[PDB]
Write a structure and sequence with these properties.
The structure is cut from a larger assembly and holds 3 copies of chain A, 3 copies of chain B and 1 copy of chain C (37 residues).
Chain A: E1 4-11, E2 14-19, E3 28-31, E4 36-43, E5 47-51, E6 63-66, E7 73-74, E8 83-85, E9 101-105, E10 112-113, E11 118-125, E12 127-132, E13 139-144, E14 148-150, E15 157-159, E16 163-165, E17 170-171, H1 194-199, E18 207-211, H2 218-228, E19 233-237, H3 247-250, E20 257-258, E21 263-264, E22 269-273, H4 280-300, E23 303-310, H5 311-324, H6 338-347, E24 350-353, E25 359-368, H7 379-386, E26 389-390, H8 395-399, E27 412-413, H9 416-426, H10 431-455, H11 462-479, H12 493-514, H13 520-524, H14 528-533, H15 545-559
Parallel strand pairs in A: 8-22, 18-25, 18-26, 19-22, 19-23, 23-25
Antiparallel strand pairs in A: 1-2, 1-6, 2-5, 3-4, 3-6, 4-5, 7-17, 9-11, 9-14, 10-13, 11-12, 13-15, 15-16, 20-21, 24-25, 26-27
Chain B: E1 2-9, E2 12-17, E3 27-30, E4 38-46, E5 49-54, E6 66-69, E7 76-78, E8 85-88, E9 104-106, H1 130-133, E10 146-148, H2 154-164, E11 174-183, H3 185-198, E12 204-210, H4 215-235, E13 239-245, H5 247-260, H6 274-282, E14 286-287, E15 294-302, H7 311-316, E16 322-325, H8 328-332, E17 345-346, H9 362-386, H10 393-410, H11 419-430, H12 443-449
Parallel strand pairs in B: 8-12, 10-15, 10-16, 11-12, 11-13, 13-15
Antiparallel strand pairs in B: 1-2, 1-6, 2-5, 3-4, 3-6, 4-5, 7-9, 14-15, 16-17
Helix pairs in contact in B: 4-5, 9-10, 9-11, 10-11
Chain C: H1 6-36
The chains are: A alpha+beta (561), B alpha/beta (450), C mainly alpha (37).
GO molecular function (chain A): ATP binding; proton-transporting ATP synthase activity, rotational mechanism; proton-transporting ATPase activity, rotational mechanism
GO biological process, one term (chain A): proton motive force-driven plasma membrane ATP synthesis
Enzyme class (chain A): translocase
Chain lengths: 561, 450, 37, 450, 145, 152, 145
């Protein structure tokens, strides 16, 4: 009765269990039928268990056994191209036991090692997998395999004369993987999307919330980022699936390609499904399993992106478990405990100096789905308070066919100053000044449009009409990006600044021409404008040539007067 | 084995068993009633007592009244012969014909078959409606909701698709599953007559749930329908189109019992479980294993109080590959079908269009029409602000384009437009715009198609 | 000027929509906590 | 004496003692744990059982697990050497230095010392920020909240005051106590680095509570901070400035446990005891006996959902002598600091201004700027109603004054303005108004200062 | 259905009437059922529900009302009575919102069921245009039928 | 209340064969208001044809609940058994409601909108149902209830 | 009435004060009773009531939160003291709603008893108009008196 127990009663979704004397609070337990559950209530004469599935498959007297884990994950060769679920397992094992991997020794007998040290390399999937000493293990390498082929279960090395190491390792998804330090936000996570990279930057290891109503394009921002962001690995927690969003990803993503290599994107991805038939427990643990896997890859020295479809549904699954445990309901009937937990999750994000030096990072992009436009609790409210970035897909911007449908007035990011020096040193000296100038343009447009909504546009001076003209070019030629175009699907840093300078240079020239009594109508139909409009489709620097093409054209307008 | 009622509160009945407890989901039968009264086990309370939900009224029940356990839940009498029949929400005949002769007896919750493949929806379903086929193409395996409101002809559209849908040269046979929930006797008689007269009934299974049928029968209706679809698609290799009207009415019934079940209510009085029950229905769609068949859904989502942010319609959006949103304002302007051209989307649209599917210029034309219509609609506001005469020549063209889009592209005189027909109308209306203003159509397409 | 009162009127009713009805999912939730307890 | 757990529900643990019950507030220690797990007694249930609240997770607890009573609450290792150290919410080192060597060990609830005098707050605290020092002067012994919202730089302001604050020629030494609650690891690393780099750490005690630290540790954080402040002020005669961010986050944790404690919830889901717990924190401020020292508070109150009427921020207003309210709307207009000039007040402002303190014209200038800015802001509404050109010449001046107030007085390019500098800017902007329209400045001041 | 009568009786009044109505149509008669009104019936039902401590929703009405009201109107129709012969029950229900709001209870739920709506317009009445039926806001789904 | 008192002083049934009477009931009023109402009825001679019931703010809440019922019963008696046209003036119904609402909580009911008793409309109906012509058609009961808007 | 004091003491504080107030008016003095505030007194009373397990109502306040408050304000007045002579107790009570809501406890019940209300207006204050009493929202029933 220490390691196992027997069901006393079941109905109303809680299983009451006699025994399990050594179970931990929040441990996964296993029913004979094969269902899993979470130990929620520990009482003097029972354990109350939340069932992650249908409780009719549970009967009084049924045997229940400990797993010993809040949960765990396997972390080794065989993760790439793999499709799992909420608790990692083929869409059951986790890592192939038969598959042979080419292990390459990167340490000699006598070397002193510490948790995070790289002892070998495996070209499991190009990607090159990095075999590390599990966290909390150090000493001297007394034995190490030679360059050959081995299965996961095999021992490749021994430390301190007997801890045995394999190519994989296990880790509690609920516990954030260790690191030396969480470096301050310094390096931008190059998205390739102009509005994001320019106005609402995400830092590598930053937490940036994605929030808005259903069908605004939240998931799509995430998917484009994975297809094109500068993270080597992606950890997609495709939660809040329904109707067929499961099968929509089941046989679909296995075909989606990696724009960078032209190989399957799954070859650098880990899927974590959260369907409706799954217990609230599993979906609750899914973000923790994912973050742990994410922290595992950053430990190797990779920059990984963690995309969380979504936390609104995770908080609903948690409220179901809490109410079944009879915890006191608060606002919208959510338990008091949620805010500290959700924050604790986002805190595990960051770019660190991994164990044994080297830098890696986990950037989190979380979807926000309020009950319906209310944008209050759970999701939004608590999230927007943690995250440093918010990209507001705007249904009105979408209906107007302005893509990406990111509201440049309601979105925000702070990391701007944190990453400006990376851009100034590696891309362009005028990155920060350029984005500040464009944002002031967009800010001015917003104010102008509010007034025009009142007094109409007929009274508008030429100076104000020019600002709307250029403001519109920023929205259409820069902010909007075509995720479906083979070229504009990703916009390299070098291309982002060059397009910015074409727009800002057209602005200066526009304001300069007006100041010299050039009709705005003459500028509005300037031939270069149509080229500036298709610049996002050019994959060659022919784009910066537009600056000189712009200047001479204005001169031809200074000529005619 | 037999039990005795120990408590009755509205639809919830507690029942104590001295020997053998019935497992969750089992159907129990109340003894001593004029009409069959089923109790579905929902929970094991402890002390040999289970908590149940009644499938019909509980007036006249007494404590101590006897109950038997049937040994199973409720289920689908699966057979290819389901085609050509009209049934109730529970799969009982409504057409005066004999009960179905099952080839297999399937559970209905979605556990049976495990039919779905991990492949993306693809290939064309010709609805015969231009505003769907041309601009918002329905694809095999997709969930594409009709988004409407009270008073609008959403059911006329649903019935028309049921009559017209096909999978143009597919090696696979095509079938329709049409399920109606909480409808009037008049509506039921109309739907029946329509299927029978047109000969649409030959390739369809129809499930009709009336407003006065038990609330539990309404809850089971979409599950009977989806199980039949998955059977036909997986075991017979068919491309099946499932039409479910109205999901909002399904939700009103599920919501109705949540209170009797003891839950603390969520926003707007809804069940706290709204999204994880609704997920059990929208998860059931896509290509089936073997890739010979597929299950496609067209759920109808009426806005309660015309509010698209109500939790029911709002949570349904994620379950779809194409959405057609109808608007009362548009209907009141006499524009039918009353589709909001700036709120109807194709989530999986890009997977069903282009060369070898529709035509190479399809995405460009769709993008340009959407952009021009949205600008034209905003200009209707600007006309109101400044007056028609103060509008620029360029804006006047976009204003006029919005009327042309509504008069000629949205409006169909009932009529099965091929995608070629729909693109032709699209190009014809686009001519109203200055060629210099076609920002979203590459020059290659203008030269070839304009 | 009857433009003001016009579309801006739509204004007051999405505003008013928003909450005598929202403020009510609520007088009633809290009932609901120890209304349910 | 030892007890045994009889029940566990999340953070609430019941513990039965056969001999000697631990009094309310005592810290108990759970035996058999890898990391120290404290249980704070909250109630005596009867039958030798107490109800407690855990300071860390309760996963892995078993019924019957042993617990010891430490004989006291959690406590502060009090010493002047607290200055220069960074600690957790519980007062454990975070700076890799040794644990504090206590001169005294003090209870933290506010019962220790009985330090406060029955005298009014008085005398200047120079924050180095013009919008506080000049217009809303902070006084020794006052509670002057920063009133903000999510996304706003309230923590930047809090950190800047921590770096800059002093008590200009005072015979008494000055110290800062900075307490942060429910902050990220990134924010904690930033605060640490800031205190260490600037040398602000030399005269400060810093308590940092992380989001993932136990909820009970967050509750104890402000009490550790206030006890240290009262010790330094009363036993060492110091003027101490306590900065607490964010009170709303403290409240989210206290609220989180109220449910586990069995209480019927109050408005907005909050604990019914919201105002009498919050009173235990705002009561702890003012001049200390001897009148050599004092405790001043600058609590940060972020509006949840930007709602200043939410019970948390709304109940905090009464605990303050000066309030600085930040507004998202103002921040979005690019006005920083984003202070609402018509919602920031100095309850005790009149006690820290005038001849011999600031300058004789200070009250008149403050009154006139406030009146002109409020009129100017209303006129922004009138401009929207009628149009800019329909505004009178006089109203146009007030409209323009509001922009001037925001551009020149509110906005500081980070910069330590003396009260003389702040009054000069005030008079410079006032010149924009007609002299005949300066209703709130006596003629004596106009002649002398205009 | 007077005010001194329990909420219970007024609640049951439409059911007693419809049953009597169905009884006459069974004979082969066409009967008209005129319901003054359902707004007051839903107020009597809300009183009973609140006294039973059922959870209040919009305007404090119980969740159960929409399905019930619909079930009532569903009993309307022209049928082929037991033993052949045709009869019918036509229902005309009065709508009285709390005051012009025309939301819940009455109107909202009713206008969603009923196939016909004859909108008496106070402005049409003041103008002495009788019957005061607004030919722009009224509708019938039976025109084609 | 000035309007209510003025009607009490002035009301009549112009050439009726039936005698006329007033029943004036005040609920939850101050001592000052009670002294004023008394003085007014006595000075004007309105008291000769009136029955007056006065409930003070500090009188038991149950006595306030019973006040309108004492008043309506007296009116029905005078109208039916004596054939009189009786005018009943009840101020203030909102104050009656504040008392009835005050006990609903102590009675164990789940509150309805705005904190009110769930039974608000079926208790209030017991008072507004009591009016109209009486059998015989010699008398009648008429009501002028005062309804102050809480918070306007 | 500090926060460290039991809900009991703060509850009794208005009664101790009013009694002392009535004592001085008995001498033939006109006394002013200023009550900072009754919102906090009703919160202290709700704490005591909930601890006694009395049924919570609106905002979780006990049902006996209106008759009591009224009984307090009723003890106000100018009287002819025992043995002739005139004295009086005038009450000025502070109103502090949970936050602008201006509903329960404090405001709602109080504004129904009191004959005078002086509405300090934060907008009048920001505009530097002192006293910041809103001459449109304030009222007294003593003008003619």
């Amino acid at each position: 009765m220490i390691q196992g127990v027997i069901q006393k009663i079941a109905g109303p979704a809680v299983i009451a269990k006699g025994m399990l004397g050594a179970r931990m609070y929040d441990i996964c337990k296993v029913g004979e039928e094969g269902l899993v559950g979470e130990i929620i209530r520990l009482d003097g004469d029972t354990a109350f268990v939340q069932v992650y599935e249908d409780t009719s498959g549970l009967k009084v007297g049924e045997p229940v056994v400990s797993t010993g884990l809040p949960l765990a994950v396997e972390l080794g060769p065989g993760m790439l191209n793999g499709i799992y679920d909420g608790i990692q397992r083929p869409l059951v094992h986790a890592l192939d036991r038969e598959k042979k991997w080419a292990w390459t020794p990167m340490v000699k007998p006598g070397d002193e090692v510490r948790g995070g040290m790289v002892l070998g390399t495996v070209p499991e999937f190009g990607f090159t997998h990095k075999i590390l000493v599990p966290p909390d293990v150090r000493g001297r390498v007394k034995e190490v395999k030679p360059a050959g082929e081995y299965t996961v279960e095999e021992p490749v090395v021994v430390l301190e004369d007997g801890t045995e190491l394999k190519m994989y390792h296990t880790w509690p998804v609920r516990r954030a993987r260790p690191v030396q330090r969480k470096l301050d936000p310094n390096t931008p996570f190059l998205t390739g999307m102009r509005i994001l990279d320019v106005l609402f930057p995400v830092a590598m290891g930053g937490t940036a919330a994605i929030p808005g109503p259903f069908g605004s394009g939240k998931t799509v921002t995430q998917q484009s980022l994975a297809k094109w962001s500068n993270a080597d690995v992606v950890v997609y927690v495709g939660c809040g699936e329904r109707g067929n969003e499961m099968t929509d990803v089941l046989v679909e993503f296995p075909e989606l390609t990696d724009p960078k290599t032209g190989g399957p994107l799954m070859h650098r991805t880990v899927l974590i499904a959260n369907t409706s038939n799954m217990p609230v427990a599993a979906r609750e643990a899914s973000i923790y399993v994912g973050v742990t896997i994410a922290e595992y890859f950053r430990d190797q020295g990779f920059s990984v992106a963690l995309m969380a479809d979504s936390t609104s549904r995770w908080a609903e699954a948690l409220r179901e478990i809490s109410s079944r445990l009879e915890e006191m309901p608060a606002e919208e009937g959510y338990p008091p405990y949620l805010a500290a937990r959700l924050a604790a999750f986002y805190e595990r994000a960051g770019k660190v100096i991994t164990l044994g030096g080297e830098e890696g990072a986990v950037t989190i992009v979380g979807a926000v789905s309020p009950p319906g436009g209310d944008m209050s609790e759970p999701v939004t409210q608590s999230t927007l308070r943690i995250v440093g970035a918010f990209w507001r897909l705007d249904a009105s911007l979408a209906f107007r066919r302005h893509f990406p449908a990111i509201n440049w007035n309601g979105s925000y990011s702070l990391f701007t100053s944190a990453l400006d020096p990376w851009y100034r040193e590696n891309v362009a000296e005028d990155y920060p000044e350029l984005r500040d100038a464009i944002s002031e343009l967009l800010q001015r447009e917003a104010g102008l449009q509010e007034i025009v909504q009142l007094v109409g546009p007929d009274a508008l001076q030429d100076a104000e009409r020019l600002v709307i003209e250029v403001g519109r070019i920023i929205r259409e030629d820069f902010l909007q990006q075509n995720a479906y175009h083979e070229v504009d699907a990703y916009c390299s840093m070098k291309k982002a600044y060059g397009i910015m300078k074409m727009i800002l240079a057209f602005y200066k020239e526009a304001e300069a021409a007006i100041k010299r009594g050039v009709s705005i109508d003459e500028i509005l139909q300037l031939p270069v404008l149509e080229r500036i409009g298709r610049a996002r489709y050019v994959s060659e620097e022919e784009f910066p040539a537009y600056f000189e093409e712009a200047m001479k054209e204005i001169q031809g307008a200074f000529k005619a007067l | 084995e037999y039990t005795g009622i120990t408590y009755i509160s509205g639809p919830l009945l507690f029942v104590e068993n001295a020997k053998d407890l019935a497992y969750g989901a089992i159907v129990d039968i109340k003894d001593g009633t004029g009409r069959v009264r089923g109790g579905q086990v929902i929970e094991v309370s402890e002390e040999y007592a289970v908590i149940q939900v009644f499938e019909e009224t509980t007036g006249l029940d007494l404590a101590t009244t006897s109950v038997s356990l049937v040994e199973d839940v409720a289920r689908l009498g699966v057979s290819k012969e389901m085609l050509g029949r009209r049934f109730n929400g529970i799969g009982k005949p409504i057409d005066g014909l004999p009960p179905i002769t099952p080839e297999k007896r399937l559970p209905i919750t979605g556990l049976p078959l495990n039919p779905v493949a991990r492949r993306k929806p693809e290939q064309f379903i010709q609805t015969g409606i231009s505003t769907i086929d041309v601009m918002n193409t329905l694809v095999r395996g997709q969930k594409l909701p009709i988004f409407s409101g009270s008073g609008l002809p959403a059911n006329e559209i649903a019935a028309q698709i049921a009559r017209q849908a096909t999978v143009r040269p597919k090696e696979e046979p095509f079938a329709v599953v049409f399920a109606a929930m909480g409808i009037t006797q008049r509506e039921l008689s109309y739907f029946i007559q329509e299927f029978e007269r047109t000969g649409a009934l030959s390739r369809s299974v129809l499930f009709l749930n009336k407003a006065d049928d038990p609330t539990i029968e309404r809850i089971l209706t979409p599950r009977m329908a989806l199980t039949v679809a998955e059977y036909l698609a997986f075991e017979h290799d068919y491309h099946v189109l499932v039409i479910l009207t109205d999901m909002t009415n399904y939700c009103e019934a599920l919501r109705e019992i949540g209170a009797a079940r003891e839950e603390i209510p969520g926003r707007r009085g809804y069940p706290g479980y709204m999204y994880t029950d609704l997920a059990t229905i929208y998860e059931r769609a896509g290509v089936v294993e073997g890739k010979k068949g597929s299950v496609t859904q067209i759920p109808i989502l009426s806005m309660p109080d015309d509010d698209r942010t109500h939790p029911i319609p709002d949570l349904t959006g994620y379950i779809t590959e194409g959405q057609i949103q109808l608007s009362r304002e548009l209907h009141r302007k006499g524009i039918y079908p009353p589709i909001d051209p700036l709120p109807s989307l194709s989530r999986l649209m890009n997977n069903g269009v282009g060369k070898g599917k529709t035509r190479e210029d399809h995405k460009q034309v769709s993008d340009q029409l959407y952009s021009a219509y949205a600008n034209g609609v905003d200009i209707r506001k600007l006309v109101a602000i400044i007056g028609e005469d103060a509008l620029t020549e360029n804006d006047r063209r976009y204003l006029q384009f919005a009327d042309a889009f509504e008069r000629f592209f949205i409006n169909q005189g009932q009529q099965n437009r091929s995608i070629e027909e729909s693109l032709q109308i699209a190009w014809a209306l686009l001519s109203m715009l200055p060629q210099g203003e076609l920002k979203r159509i590459s020059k290659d397409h203008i030269g070839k198609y304009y | 000027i009857p433009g003001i009162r016009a579309q801006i009127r739509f204004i007051q009713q999405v505003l008013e929509q928003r909450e005598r009805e929202d403020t009510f999912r609520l007088k009633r939730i809290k009932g609901k906590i120890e209304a349910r307890e």
